[PDB]
Write a protein that binds this DNA or RNA. Structure first.
Ligand SMILES: [Mg+2]
Ligand SMILES: [Mg+2]
Ligand SMILES: [Mg+2]
Ligand SMILES: [Mg+2]
Ligand SMILES: [Mg+2]
Ligand SMILES: [Mg+2]
Ligand SMILES: [Mg+2]
Ligand SMILES: [Mg+2]
Ligand SMILES: [Mg+2]
Ligand SMILES: [Mg+2]
Ligand SMILES: [Mg+2]
Ligand SMILES: [Mg+2]
Ligand SMILES: [Mg+2]
Ligand SMILES: [Mg+2]
Ligand SMILES: [Mg+2]
Ligand SMILES: [Zn+2]
Lengths: 86, 169, 292, 117, 112
RNA sequence: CCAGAUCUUAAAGAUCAAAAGGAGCAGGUAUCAAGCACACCUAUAACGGUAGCUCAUAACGCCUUGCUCAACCACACCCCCACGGGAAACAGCAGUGAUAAAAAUUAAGCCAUGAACGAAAGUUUGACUAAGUUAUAUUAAUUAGAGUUGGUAAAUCUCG
């Protein structure tokens, strides 16, 4: 969300976010189901599915997002461009 | 490893898990195969998949390939005695070739386990030394014994300083 | 020909009474985890994998030996009076050779008194541990086997774990191994906790103990309230084997007793509590016959 | 490394840390350093009495007599150890030192009852 | 019974590189070596001089070498044992028949 | 793969293994691309004869360098070597000049291990043992000082 005032953009991006929601399927409600590797534009994310105790070892943004999803155990290495939106 | 057609065959694991171990009579194994024909197929997959496994476990055995010399695929084995084993591989599968070779000159699982048993009696549990070769270094680290003074400083009496300062006076 | 714990009869009876519970046998363990593996199977391949798992769980179930207590070792190999005051401590000499069986190693002791004797049992085991360490053994005997700690562990119902510590730490023919296994059995009997050892490899232990001590009460009662009567009857059968001549075993020969009636026989002649046994047999019989 | 001469020997390597000695009984060439390279480790000896008042000695008897059988030589203290174990007769010097010790105890006994007077 | 050579090479098989010296074949031997980084196998080559008594060797022949018990020179440690494939005249070891490449020169099913 | 030395014993063994070798692995540099006799036969050990051999899968050079560590390799004032010649030797322990950003005792014992010699009691050993010195590092407590406060990156107020 984007605005002249910081406060304003905060509001805008919140209220807009709630409109695009995904459902993320969680295996046993902690990990993902299986290993994932994706090249999105110039960013490569590579994630691996962990056992119960191995908490959230990830780029800090991914940890943030995971904590929001409910994914508690994960390993992800991002390579190529680390640009945040991508 | 990304590049290549079947990348899994460049992995240490894949190379390890192949099982053939020649007898010590075997010096040279020579493969002769063709680049074409349906019949030749099996031999080709053998060179593509197992030859790497084989070689890895028999690092001292010269393996040598020849392409399109004879109309038919075969192996030849050169032994130390001068004896020459000739194995016709024709319509045989990749797997069948590996099994048949393992049968002729392999080593029985008995043999291999005896050998590795002789290698595991090499490092004895009760010795002392460098971490590389032994379970323990000082005896400072066995439970009931006297501890490394670098951990638990000695009672003044066992110190040589105290003994010397006693004999002096 | 007095029946022994390794007799195929008694082995088969106890293997049977143990039971295979694949969920308790293979249970999540507290070790470091690695991510799970997945394969796609037919109904066929799944049945095969299950059967392999079962055969594996047989090996996991193999009973730790039971032995009677070993005899104290006292043997002097020599006396040298001359060495008498020369040392304040004792020298302990351990043959360590990789080939030798640990019951055949020579463990010798020079005392200050000068006599050269064979090592005692406890010294011997402690020593073998020092030079041939195997995980799970402390050289100094661990605190946990004092009565206090043991009681604490019984109250958290860890009895399986106790038995396993014990199998690791001591020697099956030792004094402590036997002391602790019997004290433990005694506690699962006082509390009626038998099912704790059910699919354990330790079941036949308290079986063979309770047979020879002649308390089958608790274990019969338990076995029947769990609605396993094939096992209760296997148990009285076992009692008869290990007491061929006794009024119950003999009366079972006279009356030609079928299994349930066998349990009735035993209930009448021998067992210390016949009231609870007959009552539970009643309830089981009647309730089961009316339900099915 | 290549030496001129010298024989195979069974001695004590001294491992340990200051004031806390420990020994590795060892078959080594004679001319090589005390704590250095060896042919085969044979046993260990811990001089300091432990929790139970024992000095622990370990001897690989099979290998020991294999090497003695190749004509290795023993050190005086290894001799003393084997003898103590009963794998060799007592070393004469053990016996003698024992006797000397006895006579010292005797003369200190007499000197004690002489000074008490 | 002592006749030995201290060489690791007791039997090798290789191509004949050149015949230029009297009674001596130059022979390129090739082994598979595992490049450690790529875990792959490549062909390392090495040459051997071999003693040829009758000067039997054309260039290109595949040939078998046996290690000589006593080295003939500093560079000659092998004697040529057999000629495994004569160059461009090859008799199939399987069917015992003359062949040029992948073709049979005389068919094995036409005995008479 | 072992000649030799040494130990033991008649021999056989065994320990250390020179010389000679080679499946494989082995610093940088290709603006070092050719080396220049670096091969083989004959046979008697020579006469003689073929014209080869190494190398872009790095020969031949140049630079840098102990090491893959129960250890190994090398050196022992210099001239790779040591007959000779410079010349008069701590790269044994301590010390000292010089030099460097770089700073341990001109110390005590053979009591233990090791080594040498002795038939032996034993003697010798700056190996070594026990000490001395040093915030270099750990640990234990008796010890409080240093750095920082725009962002990265924990943390600031008033003056100049
Ligand atoms: Mg030290
Ligand atoms: Mg020799
Ligand atoms: Mg050598
Ligand atoms: Mg240098
Ligand atoms: Mg020099
Ligand atoms: Mg100098
Ligand atoms: Mg010199
Ligand atoms: Mg100096
Ligand atoms: Mg000098
Ligand atoms: Mg100075
Ligand atoms: Mg310094
Ligand atoms: Mg100063
Ligand atoms: Mg000394
Ligand atoms: Mg001495
Ligand atoms: Mg001195
Ligand atoms: Zn220590």
């Amino acid at each position: 969300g984007k605005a002249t005032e910081r406060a304003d953009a905060f509001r805008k991006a919140k209220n807009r976010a709630v409109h695009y929601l995904h459902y993320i399927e969680r295996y046993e409600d902690h990990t993902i189901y299986h290993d994932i590797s994706l090249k999105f534009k110039r960013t490569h994310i590579k994630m691996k599915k962990q056992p119960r105790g191995y908490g959230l070892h990830c780029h800090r943004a991914i940890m943030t997002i995971c904590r929001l999803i409910g994914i508690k155990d994960l390993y992800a290495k991002v390579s190529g461009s680390v640009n945040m939106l991508n | 490893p990304m590049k290549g057609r079947f990348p899994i065959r460049r992995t240490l694991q894949y190379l390890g898990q192949g099982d053939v171990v020649f007898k010590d009579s075997v010096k040279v194994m020579t493969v002769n195969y063709n680049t074409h024909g349906e019949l030749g197929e099996g031999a080709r997959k053998f060179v593509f998949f197992n030859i790497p496994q084989i070689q890895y476990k028999n690092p001292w055995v010269q393996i040598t390939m020849f392409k399109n010399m004879t109309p038919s695929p075969f192996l030849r084995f050169y032994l130390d005695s001068g004896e020459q084993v000739l194995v016709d591989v024709e319509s045989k599968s990749n797997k069948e070739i590996v099994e048949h070779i393992r049968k002729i000159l392999g080593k029985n699982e008995e043999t291999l386990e005896k050998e590795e048993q002789e290698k595991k009696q090499l490092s004895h549990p009760a010795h002392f030394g460098p971490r590389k070769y032994c379970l323990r270094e000082c005896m400072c680290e066995v439970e009931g014994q006297v501890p490394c003074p670098g951990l638990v400083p000695l009672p003044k009496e066992m110190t040589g300083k105290y003994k010397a300062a006693l004999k002096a006076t | 020909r007095k029946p022994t714990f390794m007799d195929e009869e008694v082995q088969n009876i106890l293997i049977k009474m143990t039971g295979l519970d694949l969920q308790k046998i293979f249970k999540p363990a507290l070790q470091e985890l690695k991510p799970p593996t997945y394969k796609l199977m037919t109904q066929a391949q799944l049945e095969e994998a299950t059967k392999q798992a079962v055969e594996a769980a047989k090996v996991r179930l193999k009973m730790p030996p039971v032995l009677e207590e070993r005899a104290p070792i006292n043997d002097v190999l020599a006396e040298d009076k001359i060495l008498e005051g020369t040392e304040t401590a004792k020298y302990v000499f351990t043959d360590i050779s990789y080939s030798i069986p640990h019951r055949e190693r020579f463990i010798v002791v020079r005392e200050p008194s000068g006599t050269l004797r064979k090592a005692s049992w406890e010294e011997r085991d402690r020593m073998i541990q020092v030079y041939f360490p195997r995980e799970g053994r402390r050289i100094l005997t661990p605190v946990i086997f004092k009565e206090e700690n043991l009681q604490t562990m019984y109250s958290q119902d860890q009895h399986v774990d106790v038995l396993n510590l014990c199998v690791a730490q001591f020697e099956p023919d030792s004094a402590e191994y036997i002391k602790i296994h019997h004290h433990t059995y005694e506690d699962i009997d006082k509390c009626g906790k038998y099912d704790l050892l059910r699919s354990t490899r330790h079941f036949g232990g308290m079986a063979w103990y309770f047979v020879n001590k002649k308390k089958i009460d608790g274990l019969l009662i338990d076995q029947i309230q769990r609605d396993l009567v094939s096992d209760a009857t296997s148990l009285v059968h076992l009692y008869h084997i290990l007491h061929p001549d006794g009024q119950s075993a003999q009366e079972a020969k006279k009356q030609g007793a079928e299994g349930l009636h066998l349990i009735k026989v035993f209930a009448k002649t021998e067992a210390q509590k016949g009231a609870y046994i007959e009552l539970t047999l009643q309830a089981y019989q009647e309730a089961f016959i009316t339900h099915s | 490394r290549a030496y001129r001469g010298g024989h195979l020997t069974i001695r004590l390597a001294l491992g340990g840390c200051t004031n806390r000695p420990f020994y590795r009984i060892v078959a080594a060439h004679s001319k090589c350093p005390r704590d250095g390279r060896f042919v085969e480790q044979l046993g260990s000896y811990d001089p300091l009495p432990n929790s139970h008042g024992e000095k622990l000695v370990a001897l690989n008897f099979d290998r020991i007599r294999h090497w003695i059988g190749c004509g290795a030589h023993l050190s005086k203290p290894v001799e003393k150890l084997l003898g103590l174990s009963g794998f060799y007769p007592l070393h004469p010097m053990m016996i003698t030192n024992a006797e000397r010790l006895r006579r010292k105890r005797a003369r200190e006994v007499l000197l004690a009852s002489q000074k008490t007077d | 019974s002592i006749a030995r050579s201290s060489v690791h090479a007791k039997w090798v098989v290789g191509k004949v590189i050149g015949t230029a010296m009297q009674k001596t074949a130059k022979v390129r031997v090739t082994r598979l070596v595992l490049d450690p980084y790529l875990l792959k196998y490549f062909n390392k080559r090495k040459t051997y001089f071999a003693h040829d008594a009758l000067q039997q060797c054309t260039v290109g022949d595949i040939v078998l070498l046996k290690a000589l018990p006593v080295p003939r020179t500093k560079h000659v440690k092998h004697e040529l044992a057999e000629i495994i494939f004569k160059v461009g005249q090859v008799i199939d070891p399987v069917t015992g028949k003359p062949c040029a490449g992948t073709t049979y020169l005389e068919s094995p099913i036409s005995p008479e």
